[PDB]
Symmetry: D2
Subunit: 256 residues, 4 copies
């Protein structure tokens, strides 16, 4: 594997998809830097990651708490996470899955700041990553930055139009960063229905009616496993020719 | 013959360029047009020629309102005023939004948190505020339409205008979400290519002639797009009562070479 | 005032359904329409039904030609003749192709090499034969247009019409290739959704009523597409001299739910 | 550690180019590879190349069969032998199709009904014949995959390859239909960009060095695609048990410039 000695920055690797990416990354022996905002399960996630890979050097699994939902500190924090992840070396791949995980208000009660508050973590944080990565990454086709969107960008869930919009912005912005940061490669993974611990939290009591309706809306009779969706991120790290692309893993939900 | 005769159109951003050609086309079909802009004068100037290129129309079918949508205070109450004015005694039949800041972004080496967020109030919050308040001034019927604006830069972004390609990418995704939020009302996007509007003359300054010639060369047609040809996409989307959630791309085959 | 008045329109497949509505819309703008079909009876009925909806139109603006484009040994020759009389004295301005066999394919249990290959003559070979010979009969100029036909089934295919989803997917890609082969002439595609033409009731037989509800429900609008609304997409692509390499999708938001 | 270890992979078109790189990658994970080609020599030679780069693998994990899929008789029966072979006593886990004629089409001045039709036997009929017979040789299970092949030319067609761009458009649409026909089995497409296989040098001849220089410049990366990088997309779809109905594009950003 050519991801053995690799340094990968997983912005949002404390839970769900991003965590599965650090598990997959550690399976190939890479050095993984994790970024989250909750200090306690960031201890739990990183402690959880070296008992599933106990032969891996513990110093190759580093964590930092960063709050990227706040307009100050995010440039200072993104720059700090790139310093920690780069170390003496340069970072080889960056993965961003961080999202605010909050239900928007209905459209009749839409507020100006309601529209803008997601943009800080969906748009401003990656752009600050794109702002500062040349100093911490070599702009060569062997390095990658991968952003996150979803199938909801084409089949929006009801109530979620605004965040459904921002994922549309992530995909267009991804392509622009492939020109801004060329020949460095940047791409997007667009997952479908992944039953992460966060999703269980969002829908609460309406969860099981939603799981069965998600399973029914797939060519597979399934929702997506977190470690299978993680293969899309690993793919874009190993494919030194993929750039400006959208990797869609949705179980055929857009076909039914 | 024409079903846009008695129909009411609100063109948010119709004072120049593409939006103005949409108001000209709408009045060519006899529609009642309300125009929204920010420059106080040049808003009379386009209102002046449209009763002078078609004096046929009753002068009260061409009404105008000044709105500043670049500032987060003022945006909900300004669109609300323009919707009361376009609807009048009836309800609005079609809404067209072309309003955009049209100012050069910084390079991303000097990217600031404010550079990223300020385009969104006119590109994202203004249309969402339209979607918030249009039900009381439009009937939610498939004979009604709301059309947003995109570009080919959403798929082939201009160096480096990455941040605003994102917002146009957000416009397309948001369009689809609003097509289900406002069902059975129709929501769509127009994605123009290279149109030589009076703003583009201003933004390109001295690099204009080198850019016009490379735009004509990046086309299957050997030309740039007329504003009056692109306006047909907005007029088309008002007449097609089955088109919703779609992107009408008119770019001279630019994405093909 | 209208720029489709003197123009020559050839609708390959204008004897029924969507293509027929395109000739109705074209005649509303005063165009000279040549109709092409394979059924001598559906071709006399179509020209008769168009001289009772437009009695003021000159009878020479509605001429028809009989062509069987499902057969390989004469599809090139038939296309050639259709072109020559549609141009007449002058040149052809726009060509619209909707022709399709509209017969259910066999299930995958009985798929045959010929089942897969026969549709290609009318879906792929006839349009390519049109592009091969139109230069003597059209000005390859941006005010000229060639429009092919696709559907939403190319992205949401219907069971078991997988093979015809393939051919409609092939039409969209070649559309883009012919915009470069035929540049600066304009080539585009319309992708309709659910249009209840007379061919569609024939395929659905007794399951028709259950299928209409199914479609109606599965759309953002509460409707199927009118033939006269989908026809707006073809007329639009004739009026927008900048639209090229594009896909005009008319689906009632079916791809959103 | 590896879940492609006991896995049986059928690479239809693995004697050269991309499909060959897919068989190399599969054997790196310990998969059992069945290779299909039409050149007996290439096929033995290709199998010889693979057991000298992997001398430790059991030679029975590298089995080959000669198939001519260019002809209407024997193509269903050759697909059927190849399925028995790959399956053996177990069932097939993944199928990869890269087989293509790789010959320059004639110009449109000499376009014939047969030049158009003939590619469809290997572009469309062979995969459909694979989907027709694989259920007795594959589970219809989410852990098994069928991967077809398209390319970036389906969206930015190279001249004069319009007809072959069309067939690649059919493969992607057919992929989506086959993802529903064979559900819950997974069906997908890989859309490579510029890969300098020996077949591409054969087509480009003396214009090769000028063509690679213009291909490298038309990418965001300053390179063409490695066969070993593009093969990772096929391996990925074996690895992602949630990917279905998708297009994995690996083109070096050529569609951005
Ligand atoms: N799951 C799906 O079906 C689906 C579909 C489409 C798109 N997506 C996108 O996939 C990505 C991953 O989603 P997920 O299912 O894995 O949910 P998740 O487990 O909640 O992932 C969120 C990650 O981001 C962190 N985070 C939350 N707020 C943060 C903040 N202000 N600043 C920095 N980090 C923050 C979280 O750490 P903390 O513990 O500190 O909060 C966590 O590590 C998201 O972008 C999502 O929008 C998911
Ligand atoms: N022309 C092209 O080649 C091209 C290409 C791709 C995309 N587009 C997009 O198409 C749309 C039309 O562009 P255009 O070429 O026609 O330029 P334009 O003539 O300047 O159109 C701008 C319209 O919106 C108004 N406007 C600007 N800022 C406003 C603000 N804060 N509040 C309210 N109204 C405001 C303008 O009037 P004021 O004078 O009062 O500001 C004008 O009526 C834009 O969204 C553009 O991004 C254009
Ligand atoms: N209806 C829908 O909902 C829908 C949706 C998506 C896509 N489409 C596609 O749009 C196109 C039009 O479909 P439609 O609904 O209008 O069905 P249609 O009424 O049967 O249209 C078929 C047209 O093509 C002609 N035609 C058929 N075979 C011919 C042949 N060998 N030679 C010459 N002409 C031939 C027909 O005339 P003859 O009487 O001589 O056969 C007729 O004018 C089709 O390609 C269809 O697949 C339709
Ligand atoms: N390289 C690119 O730039 C590029 C770009 C887009 C798409 N693609 C697509 O990628 C696929 C792979 O191409 P490639 O470049 O790897 O070319 P390649 O090496 O020529 O691949 C051809 C493969 O197909 C087999 N094949 C050809 N004709 C056959 C027949 N009649 N029966 C059975 N097998 C047959 C060949 O075997 P024999 O020669 O043994 O018969 C060989 O295994 C092709 O579909 C190509 O169009 C390639
Ligand atoms: C819609 C959602 C509540 C949901 N409902 C499910 C049912 C079954 C399996 C997964 C889900 C999910 C995951 C989602 C996907 N959406 C993409 C942008 C906003 C949202 C909301 C959230 C998100 O971030 N996670
Ligand atoms: C890039 C731009 C300066 C430009 N350069 C040209 C050269 C030749 C012909 C047209 C143009 C245009 C029109 C554009 C298209 N872009 C889409 C989003 C931002 C921007 C900027 C502006 C816009 O709104 N109008
Ligand atoms: C599938 C079909 C029988 C169908 N079943 C419906 C139920 C409700 C409303 C509309 C339909 C339609 C319209 C379709 C769409 N398909 C696109 C290519 C082939 C086909 C077949 C036909 C076509 O041309 N018209
Ligand atoms: C067009 C082609 C001759 C070509 N010309 C190049 C110049 C520089 C770098 C790469 C190429 C290629 C690779 C291509 C891509 N096309 C996709 C379908 C048919 C074809 C033909 C062939 C293919 O399979 N490989």
């Amino acid at each position: 594997d050519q991801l053995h000695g690799s340094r990968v920055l997983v912005i949002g690797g404390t839970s769900g998809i991003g965590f599965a990416v650090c598990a997959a990354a550690l399976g190939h022996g890479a050095i993984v830097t994790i970024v989250g905002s909750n200090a306690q399960k960031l201890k739990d996630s990183v402690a959880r990651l070296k008992s599933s890979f106990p032969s891996t050097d513990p110093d190759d699994i580093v964590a930092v708490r960063c709050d990227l939902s706040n307009s100050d500190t995010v440039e200072q924090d993104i720059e700090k996470a790139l310093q920690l992840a780069a170390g003496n070396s340069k970072i080889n791949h960056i993965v961003i899955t961080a999202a605010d995980m909050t239900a928007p208000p209905p459209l009749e009660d839409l507020t100006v700041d309601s529209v803008q508050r997601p943009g800080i973590i969906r748009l401003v944080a990656p752009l600050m990553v794109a702002k500062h990565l040349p100093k911490y990454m070599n702009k060569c086709p062997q390095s990658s930055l991968t952003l996150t969107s979803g199938a909801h960008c084409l089949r929006p869930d009801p109530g979620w139009t605004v965040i459904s919009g921002y994922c549309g912005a992530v995909e267009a912005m991804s392509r622009g960063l492939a020109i801004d940061l060329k020949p460095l490669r940047v791409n997007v993974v667009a997952p479908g229905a992944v039953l992460t611990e966060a999703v269980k939290d969002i829908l609460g009591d309406a969860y099981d009616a939603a799981v069965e309706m998600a399973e029914a809306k797939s060519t597979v009779g399934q929702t997506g496993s977190p470690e299978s969706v993680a293969q899309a991120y690993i793919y874009l790290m190993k494919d030194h020719y993929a750039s400006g692309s959208v990797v869609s893993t949705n179980g055929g939900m857009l076909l039914v």
